[PDB]
């Protein structure tokens, strides 16, 4: 059931952590996708793997797990994702191992039916991105390390306080989603514990003034770019907030329901603006994911079911072809040595299908029609629009800057003038871009198949901010 | 320009923190060694305390 | 579903000659464009002689995927497939010696079947899926000489105004779905007759409508991105200026004419523009 | 019936050391000690009370908590003094005595016999030691005075000196007062903080560890008892941890900062105060016990006179399995999942929230976020490049020592459902 799944990349990362070989995890992480996408099917509603068992009675604390329509297909894209890095890694570390880990954990986190268990998967993917992190590449390892932390954990330690205050001041007995759910906070209190909750999350979504941790974690990770794929997987910001934040305080939400759209729109305006003036693959893969979280928090901010639906599946989508892109700018380091976008310029007449990979990844990202990204983008934008037209409008001042940076990127870096000449492709990345074209297309040409059950739990949730 | 000020955002990050180091080396220059230092500050913050307890 | 196949021919002929395609005798990505080209033609001719077709396909929720083969799209599949198969076989004159043959053909069947999504389509999410497909397939092509790097900058803006007339394309969509809740022409039309409501934003949608075909159809202010597209080869600047990818301006209005017919100012306002 | 071994242990070797190596007095002394801690858990839900003696779960916990130090910290102590052993012995038996009683003056003779000592066990005779010596024993004789005061003041407001009667309005708060000043310097809580620094960087190594373990673990096993007012406890929260956490940003030698981290524990253990839970503040003080413990074994192994940041690094090359123990110890002190750490914190600010203490409890979290700062420039250390530094790899006595305290942190944050349903009187 759903604990298999979750534990199934943990149980590999550690296999492959202690034990040998690097091959362990390729098919590991093979073994998880195949068993995430047979829960992706036949899935009957949330209750459909659910499972739980006591840990402390007297306190509340139960293992509370089941797939909503939201977790089945999250944890789809994430089997997906993390197998697509362990195949195309080339890290090679021995760590691959911690990135099946954290695969795991971010499965638990999705998967999690109460509060504490989800805040417990919250707080526990800090360990293996600073592990990673430190031992594992970087020049100013140490302080993007300690800088992006701290930010996580000076958000995370008060909302425990936050989710303490909304379970006793609601008097729900137990910690469970549905139970906490059934017990609503009052004014003025459901006030500071949604203050609580909104600065842990949105120091996570990221949005605009938060955002200053996200550029040094994806600089000086391992040049590959495993670890920034998984760490673009941690943005889970947005889902906490459509799930736990919202509903269990949508008094204080009323207040702050302007000021996090705006925020929202102007991070990704900056996001998607900033990302012309990188001179890096990193500095311009880093703000392109702040675009697209600030595109995701606006759709679920503004209520409208429509917006939240939108916001939900760019975000899978945009975690998916992000870890891609970041994957391909790693391997084309290590057959190159740089991310430099300037030099190297000579590469689609030596690369013959990689071209087409970078184009179609990069195109995913602006958001074409036909790709992942733009079913998100489009409702997100109708929902928001619903919800105020002005900031919907300058939010999407975004897409002329996206294909502004895609496209100078993609042309310096491939288009222009021979240079030495670039190896074509390897064998595992071969099938990399194969499954990540076909992903692709799958996502954002039927997005009726995928995203089904977001749809009532938008529909519901943005219900509920009424009477 | 905004790539110059988000650099700018994150030294001011950076500026708060070394507020937190200066601040913590503040409260640790508290303690420097001579017992009546020790003592005196002991007693005060006892009788600060009795105080509070009203 | 038979329908579809005008779309889906210069579809797998893409991606016949694009994944593979240099597995194949330098003329036969062009005859098999030309002939995909041909017997959609036909196909078109065929449906349109039989009285008319739809199609609808599950789509989003509230967006399905709807498309609509009438006299007047069959016009424009018409001329797309008669000048498309003509200007296949200029290319496969045309193009000798230079590498990226397949690649090339690939470009126009992919060109091809999205400018055919355009034209047929109930919905004007499908007409956004065929714009921006047009506007890739241009900056593929007008970039196809990659090993110049002024040849690349002109697609590179002709991008970045496509995406400009696009932005306006989904601001005005966003409005017309937040009034009605349709967003199908069908029914888009059914539900514009009679007792109009909030004239103002309806006026509104209607003009970032028409910003939208500016930037396609290069118009004033967005003109200056049209002659750059000189970059690109003879035949693919012949595809671009008569036959798509700027018709797709005027038929848009054609199509919205039951808005643009209750926007007498709007439609003075493009009168004006026009004559500029 | 198990302080009556403590004690036949203790008067006859106070004589056999006359006649039997220090080595054979060690030998007896950790007997001494493990009969103890077994005849504790053998006694596991059997409350015995005689006199004023009187257990409970709290007597049972803390003082298998005080055994385990004591048996950790006689296990390194290697010296030719067989007195070097006799005092620890006391030391045990003495926070026993702190634990097992309500009344006040016998809680006070339980003090002095408790640390007296240490007094005597921190003379290695380096000059730092004497320093730290004469420190501890003046303000330590201070807080004596100013509790036993306190203890008047409680006879003044009622006719016994055992805690829980009804008591008076500013008389009884005042006596509470002047009894909380003593226990919080016992427990190092600020603004009674400054003696733990200084005595810790001074004191040998090892017995650095026996006291940041057993001494805290007795005075808040003391404090348990004491009806304290909120008012009171936030202030000494709020100062503790925030003195903590920020002198600690400005330590350059690891025992200062981990006294000053010690005393922001301590503010943190001050939270479960709030309620008395005796369950949260039981659990709390296993796990930092065990990881404590772990550290300063560690640190013993490297140098009992002091011990700079960078000698901790390159341990891992070193010594894999310390380096992995001492991050383990790190982040469990940092109260960081899936570690028991979080599980100890959680339920001190779960007592907390229950009282309705918020903006302590905010600014306590805040801290403690702070507090990550330097506890991964000390758990990450463990995997830098070696510097010069003296390394003694123990023997497999403090190897087996860490591995057990290690093992057993993240066994019960993994599954804390485990012993939690037997921390009440003991199903």
Known sequence: ?467 | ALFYGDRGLLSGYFGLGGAARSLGQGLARLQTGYLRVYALLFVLGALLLLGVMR | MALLGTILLPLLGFALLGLFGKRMREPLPGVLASGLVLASFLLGAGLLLSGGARFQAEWLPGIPFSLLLDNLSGFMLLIVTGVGFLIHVYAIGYMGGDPGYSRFFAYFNLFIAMMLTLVLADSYPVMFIGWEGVGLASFLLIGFWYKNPQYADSARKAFIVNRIGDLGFMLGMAILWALYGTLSISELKEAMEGPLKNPDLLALAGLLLFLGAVGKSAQIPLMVWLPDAMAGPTPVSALIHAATMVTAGVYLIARSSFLYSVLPDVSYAIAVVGLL | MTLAILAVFSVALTLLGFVLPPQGVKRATLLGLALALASLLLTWGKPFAFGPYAVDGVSQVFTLLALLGALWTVGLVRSGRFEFYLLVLYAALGMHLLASTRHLLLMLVALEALSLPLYALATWRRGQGLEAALKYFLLGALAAAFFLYGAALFYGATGSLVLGAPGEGPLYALALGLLLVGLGFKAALAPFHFWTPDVYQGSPTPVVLFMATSVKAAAFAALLRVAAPPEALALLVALSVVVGNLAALAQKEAKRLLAYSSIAHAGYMALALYTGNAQALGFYLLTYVLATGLAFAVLSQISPDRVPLEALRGLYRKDPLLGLAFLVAMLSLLGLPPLAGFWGKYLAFAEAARAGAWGVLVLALVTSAVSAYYYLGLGLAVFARPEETPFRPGPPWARAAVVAAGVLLLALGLLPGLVLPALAAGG
């Open chain 1, 1 to 467: 059931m759903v604990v298999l799944a979750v534990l199934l990349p943990v149980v590999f990362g550690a296999l492959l952590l202690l034990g040998l070989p690097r091959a362990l995890g390729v098919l590991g992480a093979g073994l998880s996708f195949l068993l995430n996408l047979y829960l992706f099917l036949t899935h009957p509603g949330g209750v459909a793997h659910a499972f739980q068992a006591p840990l402390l009675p007297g306190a509340g604390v139960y293992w509370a797990f089941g797939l909503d329509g939201l977790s089945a297909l999250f944890f789809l894209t994430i089997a997906l994702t993390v197998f697509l890095g362990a195949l195309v890694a080339r890290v090679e570390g021995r760590f691959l191992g911690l990135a099946l880990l954290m695969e795991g954990l971010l499965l638990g986190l999705f998967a999690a039916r109460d509060l504490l268990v989800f805040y417990v998967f919250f707080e526990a993917a800090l360990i293996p991105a600073l592990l990673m992190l430190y031992l594992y590449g970087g020049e100013g390892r140490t302080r993007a390390l300690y800088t992006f932390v701290l930010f996580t954990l000076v958000g995370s330690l008060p909302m425990l306080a936050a989710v303490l205050g909304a379970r006793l001041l609601s008097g729900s007995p137990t910690f469970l989603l549905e139970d906490l759910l059934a017990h609503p906070l009052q004014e003025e209190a459901a006030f500071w514990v949604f203050l609580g909750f909104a600065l842990a999350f949105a120091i996570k979504t990221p949005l605009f003034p938060l955002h200053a941790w996200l550029p040094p974690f994806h600089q000086e990770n391992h040049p590959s770019g495993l670890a920034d794929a998984l760490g673009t997987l941690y943005k889970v910001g947005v889902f906490a907030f459509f799930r736990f934040a919202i509903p269990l305080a949508p008094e204080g939400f009323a207040q702050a329901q302007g000021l996090l759209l705006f925020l929202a729109a102007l991070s990704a305006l900056y996001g998607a603006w900033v990302a012309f003036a990188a001179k890096d693959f990193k500095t311009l893969l880093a703000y392109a994911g702040l675009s697209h979280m600030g595109v995701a928090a606006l759709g679920v901010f503004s209520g409208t079911p429509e917006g939240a639906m939108g916001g939900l599946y760019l975000l899978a989508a945009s975690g998916v072809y992000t870890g891609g892109l970041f994957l391909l700018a790693g391997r084309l380091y290590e057959r190159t040595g740089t991310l430099e976008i300037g030099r190297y310029r000579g590469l689609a007449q030596s690369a013959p299908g990689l071209a087409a990979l970078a184009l179609i990844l990069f195109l995913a990202m602006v958001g074409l029609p036909g790709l992942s990204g733009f079913p998100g983008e489009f409702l997100t934008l109708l929902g928001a629009y619903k919800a105020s037209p002005w900031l919907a409008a300058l939010a999407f001042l975004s897409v002329i800057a996206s294909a502004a940076y895609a496209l100078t990127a993609f042309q310096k870096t491939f288009w222009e003038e021979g240079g030495s000449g670039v190896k074509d492709l390897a064998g595992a990345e071969w099938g990399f871009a194969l499954l990540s074209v076909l992903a692709l297309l799958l996502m954002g040409v039927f997005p009726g198949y995928f995203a089904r059950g977001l749809h009532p739990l938008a529909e519901a949730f943005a219900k509920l901010l009424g009477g």
